[PDB]
Amino acid sequence: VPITPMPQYSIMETPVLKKELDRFGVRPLPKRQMVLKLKEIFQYTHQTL
C-alpha cells in the first residue's frame, strides 16, 4: 500500500471540492463544510503516519 499525501483541501477551488465530493456520493455544500468533509473522509479511510 503506497503513501498517499492528503490534498490541501483548504486551498482547493470550490468547483474542485465539489468534484472531489462527487466521488463519495456527496452533494455540493458550503465551502468550509466541503473542506471539513473531505478531511474527515481522508482520515477515516487512511491511517496517518
Binding site: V1, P2, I3, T4, P5, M6, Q8, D22, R23, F24, G25, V26, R27, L29, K37, E40, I41, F42, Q43, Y44, T45, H46, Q47, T48, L49
Partner: protein, 84 residues
C-alpha cells in the same frame, strides 16, 4: 503541513441498516412497478460511494439523491429500530 496516510483495509459497509432499508423499499417498489422505485435505486447508488457512518436520515441530506422525504423515512425507521 502535509499529512501522509496509508489507505486502510477495504472496510465493510459503514451503513448496513440504511443499505438494508433502502434495498427493502427498492424491492417493494420494483415488485409493484411503483413510480418511486427510481428514488431508492438512485439513493442506494450514492450511499454505496459514501465511506462514513451516518448518524441519522437528517445527516444523509448531504448525499446526492437523498431528498427531504427519504431522509424523513430513514429517521422514522431508525426510531422504530431502537424502539423495538
Amino acid at each position: 503541513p502535509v499529512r501522509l496516510g496509508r489507505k486502510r483495509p477495504l472496510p465493510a459497509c459503514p451503513n448496513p441498516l440504511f443499505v438494508r432499508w433502502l434495498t427493502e423499499w427498492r424491492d417493494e417498489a420494483t415488485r409493484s412497478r411503483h413510480r418511486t422505485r427510481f428514488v431508492f435505486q438512485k439513493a442506494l447508488r450514492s450511499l454505496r460511494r459514501y465511506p462514513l457512518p451516518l448518524r441519522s436520515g437528517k445527516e444523509a441530506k448531504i448525499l446526492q439523491h437523498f431528498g427531504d422525504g427519504l431522509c424523513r423515512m430513514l429517521d422514522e425507521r431508525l426510531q422504530r429500530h431502537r424502539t423495538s
